[PDB]
Ligand binder design. Sequence first.
Ligand SMILES: CC(C)(O)[C@H](F)CNC(=O)c1cnc(Nc2ccc3ncsc3c2)cc1NC1CC1
Ligand SMILES: CC(C)(O)[C@H](F)CNC(=O)c1cnc(Nc2ccc3ncsc3c2)cc1NC1CC1
Ligand SMILES: CC(C)(O)[C@H](F)CNC(=O)c1cnc(Nc2ccc3ncsc3c2)cc1NC1CC1
Ligand SMILES: CC(C)(O)[C@H](F)CNC(=O)c1cnc(Nc2ccc3ncsc3c2)cc1NC1CC1
Lengths: 289, 287, 287, 286
Amino acid sequence: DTRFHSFSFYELKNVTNNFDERPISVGGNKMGEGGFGVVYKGYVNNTTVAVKKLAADITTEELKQQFDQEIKVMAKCQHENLVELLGFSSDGDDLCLVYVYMPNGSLLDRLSCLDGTPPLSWHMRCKIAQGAANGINFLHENHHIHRDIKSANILLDEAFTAKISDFGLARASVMTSRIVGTTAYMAPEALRGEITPKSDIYSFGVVLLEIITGLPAVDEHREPQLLLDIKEEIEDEEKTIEDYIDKKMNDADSTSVEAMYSVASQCLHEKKNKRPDIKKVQQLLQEMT
Amino acid sequence: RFHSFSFYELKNVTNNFDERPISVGGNKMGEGGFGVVYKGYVNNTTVAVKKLATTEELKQQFDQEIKVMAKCQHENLVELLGFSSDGDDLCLVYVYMPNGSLLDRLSCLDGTPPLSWHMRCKIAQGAANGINFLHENHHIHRDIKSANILLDEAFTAKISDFGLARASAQTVMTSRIVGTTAYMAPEALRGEITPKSDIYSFGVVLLEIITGLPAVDEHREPQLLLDIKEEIEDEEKTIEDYIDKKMNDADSTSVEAMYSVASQCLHEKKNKRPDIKKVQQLLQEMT
Amino acid sequence: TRFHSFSFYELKNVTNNFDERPISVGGNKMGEGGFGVVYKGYVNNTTVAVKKLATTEELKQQFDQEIKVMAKCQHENLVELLGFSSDGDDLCLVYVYMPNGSLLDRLSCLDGTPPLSWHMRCKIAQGAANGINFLHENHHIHRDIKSANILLDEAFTAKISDFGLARAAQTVMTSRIVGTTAYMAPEALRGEITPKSDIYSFGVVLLEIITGLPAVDEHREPQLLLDIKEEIEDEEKTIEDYIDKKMNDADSTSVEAMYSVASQCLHEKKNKRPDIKKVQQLLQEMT
Amino acid sequence: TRFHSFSFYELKNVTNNFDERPISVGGNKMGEGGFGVVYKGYVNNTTVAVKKLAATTEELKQQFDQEIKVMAKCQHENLVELLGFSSDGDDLCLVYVYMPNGSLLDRLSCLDGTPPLSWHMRCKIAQGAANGINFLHENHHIHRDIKSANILLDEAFTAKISDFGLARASVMTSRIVGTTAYMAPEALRGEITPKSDIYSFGVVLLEIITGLPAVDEHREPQLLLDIKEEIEDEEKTIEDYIDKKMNDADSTSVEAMYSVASQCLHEKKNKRPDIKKVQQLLQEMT
Ligand SMILES: CC(C)(O)[C@H](F)CNC(=O)c1cnc(Nc2ccc3ncsc3c2)cc1NC1CC1
Ligand SMILES: CC(C)(O)[C@H](F)CNC(=O)c1cnc(Nc2ccc3ncsc3c2)cc1NC1CC1
Ligand SMILES: CC(C)(O)[C@H](F)CNC(=O)c1cnc(Nc2ccc3ncsc3c2)cc1NC1CC1
Ligand SMILES: CC(C)(O)[C@H](F)CNC(=O)c1cnc(Nc2ccc3ncsc3c2)cc1NC1CC1
């Protein structure tokens, strides 16, 4: 149970060029953002870092609870397929969290080639899935449910080692009055209010589909708007997985693409008890390669 | 002017026209409605063989491609090396373009890295100079689109496909309406033939370059890239909202100067459109 | 007697009959020393490391010493013994599989692993220090501290390994001199047995961590990493000139605080060296 | 070909007044040679590399004019691109596109903690560097400074030949130039020939195979060229020198690459293969 560096908000304002909203590509500090905050590049003592400045559709005590949950899970869980918390800032109404800098950002941005990054090869997306399943396994082994498994939450280091991130919504492995997560990846029972490690498997199934097709889980200007719909089109023989494979690759083979699609379709069983456990998903991805 | 090849030579150099994609291990590199392009090797030289597939209409396009290629030679126009006319198998042999088409490079087909804003400007400028030479030599392309803008070893834009080219320099009509709907000018869709229609098709190409989106996508809202121009005109969206996210060097000043050229080109009214010398001047002023 | 008793034929099955091919080449061999070869194995869903040991009564004494020390000492920075196999002349030891192998191989990026960062190196060093402390607190002298013997788990937690040479601490002598020359204290090369020698070997490990260079390299000038300490002491070089270039997060303040600990550990005169609790305090003050 | 004419005061702004701190720390310095220091910069939203030339003054001016003249003629995907330059006063600057993966030298050594290149990537890099040198020899130019530090790598690890200040139109010289560790025997005594470039590329193939730089002061032997002699005299094999920092290397294509390198490193300049033959062999290897 690790202790983290306690930073003062002014130090984090200095290291992030006063939280420059300009993108890092242009010359600024902003690298990404979610509903709970904005991620900035920083330099703490020759160490390149990522500072997540938390900001408000949630309450102030709710955002504080997520900040305390992120810190509590980080203290417990340490793995190579889990991102590392370096420190934090809690002075005043400015909650900041400091992480190691991921040279390749998120799987979402790498699948979409954001900022002009080269398209991931099939072989690389295969290792990224294996890493993220090894990560999701350590969490489940240590009795934790992520509650927000998505490609934006899977980060890639210098070697492209998948490190799953965002533990503000994590639960100790029931129902809830505040339904949270990203609709495009959430399990049917999770959309109701159920909390179960089976929902994490479902969200990962949508992630395997994103990896295969290069398409994000939800696209407003796309037909169909949900990547899950494409699974129904394949099941009803209306389309095949070969028709959806990302054209931005040249090393994808049918045998391994259909083995990965098999894992994804098992993960996307609408009935929670029909889905495989994270150890079975991890076994299938290792057997695929 | 061009090497006369026999059909048997091209069947050997293209592995008997292997339909498998070059990425898999075959020869097929691309294809249109008039034929399929195959990779070939003619004595250590990599070449591209287009095997054409009305009968007399396809023969007229083969003769037009050769006739325009003999006349027009420019740095931004692709080079014809030879041809094969023996039998009912029409083949055309061109230099191998190491970077394929602008369409495939904007979509990163086969995993190629995304083009940067800087290269996208060089490509637009080159394609404008290429259209300019054609219009100067009294020719109307009639099929300007990103699939027809090829990229060499240095990413030099080289206009291709002159089977549909016409001799300019007023406005005439036709019974056989040809081209690609997603890029075609309103008057071209009606049957008019004018170099002004080429300017319109190039406006759609500048939009493809800015957004990374193909002119038509069945599974997209809106299905036509032209529709996005209307959304911007009616203040419903901006060009900044459509700029290709797969590039890190694009800036507002040059993206709005390129969008200005595209908006001028995309005039539904042909005589309001700029001439290719004015489009060429504007793209040069942008950089 | 607190570990799982395995039969030699179970371990033959779990290690693909002790496949000598490297794991990178599709086999089971992961590493090896002078006392045996380490193989990857699977005991159900748990990945394990089986060390197949290869004087006969001397090798048996090391097998019994490893098991006896492991039974007594249990710490987070000490590697865990799962089981063993003593049936016949085949002595096997089973441990938890360290996903990141040894500190030696990670500093050299063996098999293409990404270079360790200064932040990871700092935790590794503190962990190795915390591990040695538990051993010295429980009155044990490792006698073989080196980077090959510092293993790294799924989180890069340093786990000290190889206790076959461990002794039950005061200054005694031996007629059988054991250890690795490149790390051994002057008195330990002479036959002395003292926990002060372990501090010296750890000083060489701190130098390996700082520079990325192994303690001895035949094809290097100087062949001994210890020589580099003399060059720094005589102002002929600085520690900044030796810092591993395969890191981007190394800072002078911490690198000189770690070098200070290493310099204190590398005293030729054993009684001038700090105790493991003082080394542990200094590495805990560095960060 | 015309490049953008920058003023020295303009490039000073884009490079944070030529910050000597390394980019890893938070500064602008990315690398440096004997003829100048490379700085990261931003020209609009374009990330650039500004090479500020520094010491022979008329010799340094001749190299600046030679770099620009060759860049004007030669444009290829495996050749680095000149964006602009600054010649006002005694401060010659050259502006290029920013290479996200720096140089082949720094990637083979994992400078700044980059992951080791895999055998598959090392192969594509060798092929790219062969095609780039092929375009140069096709356009009648001799690089005269082929080395891994001068082979740059973009976002996709596309290799690009850089540094054309020493380039010649395809004789002897009174000013002998280049890097000793890669230079052909004839090049060390003034001869100027495109076969010397093939020799320097042979040393580059050896760097790619072993992960070792051509010259290391703190290494035995200090010259990578010596290791070729040890292999020729059966004293060592290429398997004994293959970079341990890769897990995807196989003996068959590693000995095929060593064959190309051994052919390039010939005693007799006329016995070495032409760049089209080297390019053919590197394509047959994969
Ligand atoms: C390719 C490119 C632009 O160089 C690279 F992507 C830049 N690096 C990053 O974008 C990028 C770098 N480091 C990150 N670190 C990090 C680690 C853990 C964590 N947990 C919660 S927030 C968070 C952030 C995230 C990044 N991107 C994420 C999208 C925000
Ligand atoms: C990136 C990659 C795969 O190496 C490269 F893209 C392969 N090259 C090509 O695809 C590709 C290569 N050469 C081409 N040459 C060419 C030149 C003129 C011409 N006029 C009419 S057809 C035609 C074809 C076209 C290519 N692609 C176009 C689709 C046909
Ligand atoms: C990076 C990569 C290839 O995943 C990693 F290197 C694999 N891990 C291992 O090789 C590796 C994995 N587990 C080990 N476990 C272990 C635990 C205790 C112990 N006590 C005496 S021997 C011994 C071995 C050692 C490893 N390597 C050591 C060299 C033998
Ligand atoms: C991996 C890391 C640190 O991100 C990357 F390496 C940073 N980029 C660069 O270092 C780096 C980036 N761009 C470069 N561009 C470039 C292009 C052509 C050219 N012709 C003469 S000098 C010169 C420089 C060189 C770089 N590095 C070379 C050592 C100077």
